[PDB]
């Protein structure tokens, strides 16, 4: 039973590690839109991403 | 007899002995007299010469994998330039493996190999071929000393008689954009009407010749003069510490079975390469090095 749940540990941590890599990749690039309207649109999109990450903090 | 299958390697540079051991097995004169409905005697002879030039370029280490290309002209009545297929290593090149293509890159002879040719890599040679009807052999080379010479601001300097023998050098600046037809126009402008040596800045060194021996002579002189310049311009550190040879004064004072101006080195290294065992079938100006014993 404990070896089975260890192999579940490995299989579970695989997705977490791949996701950490993937949002590393997408927060790496920076492309701000021109002028204040697009800048604040990017700001609220960032806040959407920040609210999204707190969901998987629970899974971690 | 009593020879190893692969030659033992030096502490540095195993490529020389390794390509030697490969050329021990693979002959460069792949043609032995089979059916060839499109080949000519001159075409076959130039194929052998081009394969031998490829192997010689590999042997001196004047090669950067497969990213350099050497083209020749069949001198038929329309187009038909010979180029190495894209993918084969230089020690793998044989006579029948060479690929005949058109000026714009259309493959007229697929050759003995399934590998296609690089369409992007032929446009640089096609610009020179469209620029001059006189040119017949184009060699593009990449040595680290030549790259260091091309990367500096002043470029080649008249410090050796070999650089004086090079003559006027055309310079092509590194655009790095590959803008096709206007890039060809800029090549035609920088190369000029008459020139022997082109330096494509930060990338490579190009020799153009009416014959294979002429291009080999020009590129050998260029490479040796470049590596002459590398040490002495490093040690000098300025014009106050370097003697420059006067070109005009030196050239004014310095000047059939008979050899051409560049056939001597080609024939000597062909003798060397046939003594190695490459069996190139090159027509020598004199069949024996010395007289037969009596």
């Amino acid at each position: 039973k404990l070896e089975q749940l260890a192999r579940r540990f490995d299989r579970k941590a695989a997705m977490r590690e791949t996701w950490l890599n993937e949002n590393q990749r997408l927060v790496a690039q920076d492309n701000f839109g021109y002028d204040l309207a697009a800048v604040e649109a990017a700001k609220k999109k960032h806040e959407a991403i920040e609210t999204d990450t707190a969901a998987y903090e629970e899974r971690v | 007899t009593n020879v190893p299958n692969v030659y033992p390697a030096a502490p540095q540079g195993g490529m020389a002995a390794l390509n030697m051991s490969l050329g021990m097995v693979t002959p460069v004169n792949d043609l032995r007299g089979s059916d060839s409905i499109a080949y000519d005697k001159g075409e076959k002879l130039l194929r052998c010469k081009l394969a031998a030039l490829y192997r010689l370029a590999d042997l001196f280490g004047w090669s950067h994998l497969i990213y350099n290309h050497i083209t020749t002209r069949v001198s038929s009545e329309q187009e038909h330039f010979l180029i190495v297929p894209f993918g084969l290593l230089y020690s793998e090149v044989t006579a029948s493996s060479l690929v005949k293509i058109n000026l714009q890159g259309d493959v007229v002879d697929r050759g003995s190999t399934n590998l296609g040719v690089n369409q992007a890599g032929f446009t640089l040679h096609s610009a020179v071929y469209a620029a001059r009807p006189d040119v017949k052999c184009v060699v593009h080379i990449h040595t680290p000393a030549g790259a260091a010479v091309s990367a500096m601001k002043c470029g080649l300097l008249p410090i050796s008689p070999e650089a004086l023998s090079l003559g006027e050098v055309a310079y092509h600046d590194y655009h790095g954009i590959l803008v096709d037809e206007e890039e060809k126009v800029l090549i035609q402008k920088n190369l000029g009407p008459k020139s022997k040596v082109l330096i494509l800045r930060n990338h490579g060194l190009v020799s153009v010749g009416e014959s294979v021996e002429e291009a080999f002579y020009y590129i050998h002189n260029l490479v040796v003069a470049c590596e002459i310049q590398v040490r002495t311009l490093a040690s000098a550190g300025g014009p106050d510490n370097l003697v420059l040879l006067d070109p005009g004064k030196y050239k004014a004072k310095s000047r059939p079975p008979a050899w051409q101006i560049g056939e001597q080195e080609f024939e000597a290294l062909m003798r060397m390469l046939d003594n190695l065992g490459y069996r190139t079938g090159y027509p020598y100006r004199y069949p024996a090095l010395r007289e037969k014993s009596k």
Binding site: - | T1, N5, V25, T26, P27, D30
Partner: protein, 374 residues
């Protein structure tokens, strides 16, 4: 041609075969031995010759000292070869040599003086009209129906591997190795002395050779087979000697041929037969490698051990490059194939220009064979 058929005479190092060209079977196959008496003969009227040749010599093994005229593929007694040729022509076939052409086979790499001496002997004494010399390994591929492939040959003299490319024998890639059947027989004695059975005279060498012929096989895996032989006695078999005694060979059955694959057992520093074939293909150019791996023919007397085919295939697969076409083509009649190839070659109409006339030899001496036959 129609009236007279060329004589096909195969001179192997251990056996000699003879027949008529265009025929399926050789007429006479006999051992190539010559025996001399070793004891004083006291019976006045029973009749004792000075020397016995061939099967008559092998019938009376107990009173003779058997000598082989061919040693390691090199002739060491030329008048002895005159005796064996006289016995072949006059007794076995009962045909005159002056009325028919003869065909001779030879090792791929032999000294020039050997060819000159064979030509001089065949023209000067036997007065044959026409003769020709052929390479032994080439004719096997003709018998195979092939013109391109690698031929491995192993007789009582020497074992050599050659490549053949549309009938051309490449001289540089021909490889030689001194692992013959006679050395295997000597090693069979050397390993039989462990059990307690002692053989020392040249008469018992034929008994040991018969034991080798009848009771041997090649292990697919040596390490597993030694453990199998140590575990159980199901591998042991019994042989019945000419004097009535019964011996149990047991473990040694797959130890006799193993000297072919690992020559370190015999003290030789050379490589195995599989490495020899691999290096022989390695020495040729790249273009013909694919049709040499895809085409391999085994021939010779030694290559009839049971299980040699699969072991050879596995050992040459282990050295070949990946996804490589590997196949071994061993005919069942693989040690009569040289005579078959010789008769086939003599049967053709365009072969008749190969014959060397008596006038040509008389004009150009014994050295004409090398110029006429390349």
């Amino acid at each position: 041609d129609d009236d007279i058929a060329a004589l096909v005479v195969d001179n192997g190092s251990g056996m000699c075969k003879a027949g008529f060209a265009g025929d399926d079977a050789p007429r006479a196959v006999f051992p190539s031995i010559v025996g001399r008496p070793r004891h004083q003969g006291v019976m006045v009227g029973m009749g004792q010759k000075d020397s016995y040749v061939g099967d008559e010599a092998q019938s009376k093994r107990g009173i003779l000292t058997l000598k082989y005229p061919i040693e390691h593929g090199i002739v060491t007694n030329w008048d002895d070869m005159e005796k064996i040729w006289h016995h072949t022509f006059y007794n076995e076939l009962r045909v005159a040599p002056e009325e028919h052409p003869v065909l001779l086979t030879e090792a791929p790499l032999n000294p020039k003086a050997n060819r000159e001496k064979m030509t001089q002997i065949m023209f000067e004494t036997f007065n044959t009209p026409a003769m020709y010399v052929a390479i032994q390994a080439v004719l096997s591929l003709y018998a195979s129906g092939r013109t391109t492939g690698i031929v491995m040959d192993s007789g009582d003299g020497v074992t050599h591997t050659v490549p053949i490319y549309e009938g051309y024998a490449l001289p540089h890639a021909i490889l030689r190795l001194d692992l013959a059947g006679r050395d295997l027989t000597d090693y069979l004695m050397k390993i039989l002395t462990e059990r307690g059975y002692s053989f020392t005279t040249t008469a018992e060498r034929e008994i040991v050779r018969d034991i080798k012929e009848k009771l041997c096989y090649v292990a697919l895996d040596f390490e597993q087979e030694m453990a199998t032989a140590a575990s159980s006695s199901s591998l042991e078999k019994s042989y019945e000697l000419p004097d009535g005694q019964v011996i149990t060979i047991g473990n040694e059955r797959f130890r006799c041929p193993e000297a072919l694959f690992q020559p370190s057992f015999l003290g030789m520093e050379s490589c195995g037969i599989h490495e020899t074939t691999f290096n022989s293909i390695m020495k040729c150019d790249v273009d013909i490698r694919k049709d040499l791996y895809a085409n391999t023919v085994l021939s010779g007397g030694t290559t009839m051990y049971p299980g040699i085919a699969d072991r050879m295939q596995k050992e040459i697969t282990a050295l070949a490059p990946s996804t490589m076409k590997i196949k071994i083509i061993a005919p069942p009649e693989r040690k009569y194939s040289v005579w078959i190839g010789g008769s086939i070659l003599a049967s053709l109409s365009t072969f008749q220009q190969m014959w060397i006339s008596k006038q040509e030899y008389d004009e150009s001496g014994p050295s004409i064979v090398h110029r006429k036959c390349f």
